[PDB]
Amino acid sequence: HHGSTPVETHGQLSVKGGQLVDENGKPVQLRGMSSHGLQWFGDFVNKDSMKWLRDDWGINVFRVAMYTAEGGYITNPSVKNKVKEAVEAAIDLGMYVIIDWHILSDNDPNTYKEQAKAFFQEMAAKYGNYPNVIYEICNEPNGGVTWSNQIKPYAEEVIPAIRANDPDNIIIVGTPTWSQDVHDAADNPLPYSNIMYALHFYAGTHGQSLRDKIDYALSKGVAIFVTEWGTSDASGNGGPFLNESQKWIDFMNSRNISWANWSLSDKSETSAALMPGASPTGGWTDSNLSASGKFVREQIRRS
Ligand code: NA
Ligand code: NA
């Protein structure tokens, strides 16, 4: 006997009729955690903390936020070793893993598109045969970067680079305005298989108007993955806004939208799940979790 794992249970994921489904074609919802930036909080990303999250929080997906700028991969490519550590841990543990090319201050994904293609080609060649892997090719386009003129052309360069090596694993594409404007993507979608579009919300800033954009996008037949959300405001402060977060969690459950919460770190942001000094290898009791972490853990443990 053994504890069943998410990948053992669900295998290769795909997008069918605008919905994430498993190898049996049955709907599946991933719920898990995102790291903070690997260049700052990578110590919290390892096989022990991922196993603890799987066993104690019930997560089935873990997202590694590999920043490009801000001391990330472009200037310090050694952070790729932490991505590889996390992917290999996810394989060992039967977990899904999101490899996130985490643009932010570099608000146009085209700025580092050559590095992105080479990085994703390497990851897809090494790990593309494993069902665990999900690619997230540009975290948050922002600042007036548009879908039709900037993001979609970027995706049309990166998707084939991945697909040449990994024909079937899911690719998630960011959307305008810090991955809010999923309606723009829905109106001009990528015509390739197993593509999803990212939506990011922060409960202290975003509410019904953003849920309305999501419902519009879903009505056009595209699939949405909330690869990042926080209980704080958009800037990482305030709250945590648990009443509004619950409305968002109930919405995502109703729409069978998968999600990852920011962040698995002890950063001085109210979205951070851990108290200062919490062990980087897991084993956290209630007192090691922030107000946000306690709530998120409870929500992932629910059915
Ligand atoms: Na594959
Ligand atoms: Na994204």
3-state secondary structure the chain: CCCCCHHHHHCCCEEECCEEECCCCCECCCEEEEEEEHHHHHHHCCHHHHHHHHHHHCCCEEEEEEECCCCCCCCCCCHHHHHHHHHHHHHHHCCEEEEEEECCCCCCHHHHHHHHHHHHHHHHHHHCCCCCEEEECCCCCCCCCCHHHHHHHHHHHHHHHHHCCCCCCCEEECCHHHHCCHHHHHHCCCCCCCEEEEEEEECCCCCHHHHHHHHHHHHCCCCEEEEEEECCCCCCCCCCCHHHHHHHHHHHHHCCCCEEEEEECCCCCCCCCECCCCCCCCCCCHHHECHHHHHHHHHHHCC
Q: Amino acid identity, residue 62?
A: F
CA 147 to ligand 2 centroid distance, Å: 13
- Contact of 37 with 156, CB cutoff 8 Å: no
Place of tokens 């952070």: 79
- Ligand 2 centre distance from Cα of residue 36 (Å): 14
Ligand nearest to C-alpha 140: 2
Query: Residues before each break in the chain (C–N > 2.5 Å)?
Result: none
- Give the separation between CA 19 and CA 31, rounded to whole angstroms: 15
Sorted by where each starts, the structural domains of the chain and their CATH numbers stand as 1-303 (3.20.20.80)
Half-sphere exposure of 303 (CA within 13 A, CB side): 4
The ligand with the least distance to the CA atom of 14 is 1
Q: How many CB atoms lie within 10 A of CB 82?
A: 18
Measured in Å, residue 80 CA sits from the centre of ligand 1 at 20
Ligand nearest to the CA of residue 123, numbered in listed order: 1
Q: Is 228 designated active site? A: yes
Catalytic residue among 136, 228, 244, 269: 228
Q: Is 141 exposed, middle or buried (0-12, 13-18, 19+ CB in 10 A)?
A: buried
Please tell me the distance from the alpha carbon of residue 110 to that of residue 187, in angstroms, as a whole number: 21
The CA–CA distances, whole Å, from 136 to 69, 96, 156, 170 equal 16, 13, 14, 9
For residue 13, how far is its CA from the centre of ligand 1 (angstroms)?
A: 10
Whether the CB-CB separation of 100 and 63 falls below 8 Å is answered with yes
* Contact predicate 169/128, CB 8 Å: yes
Q: Would residue 298 show up in a list of annotated catalytic residues for this protein?
A: no
Active-site annotation holder among 136, 140, 244, 269: 140
Ligand 2 center from residue 293 Cα (angstroms): 22
Nearest to 196 by CA among 249, 145, 159: 159
Plot region of 99 (φ>0 → left; ψ -120 to 50 → alpha; else → beta): beta
Model resolution, angstroms: 1.5
Shortest-distance ligand to the CA of residue 182 = 2
What are residue 229's DSSP bridge partners?
201, 261
Q: How far is the CA of 228 from the centre of ligand 2 (A)?
A: 8
CA distance 273 to 276: 10
136 Cα–ligand 2 center, Å? 5
Q: Are 262 and 235 in contact (CB under 8 A)?
A: no
Distance CA 174, CA 151 (A): 8
The torsion region of residue 282 among left (phi > 0), alpha (psi -120 to 50) and beta comes to left
d(CA 264, CA 242): 17
For strand 19-21 and strand 14-16, is the pairing parallel, antiparallel, or unpaired? antiparallel
CA dihedral 278, 244, 174, 45 (to 10 degrees): 10
For residue 296, give Cα distances in angstroms to 41, 75, 229, 233. 19, 33, 11, 16
Size of the chain in residues = 303
Method of determination is X-ray
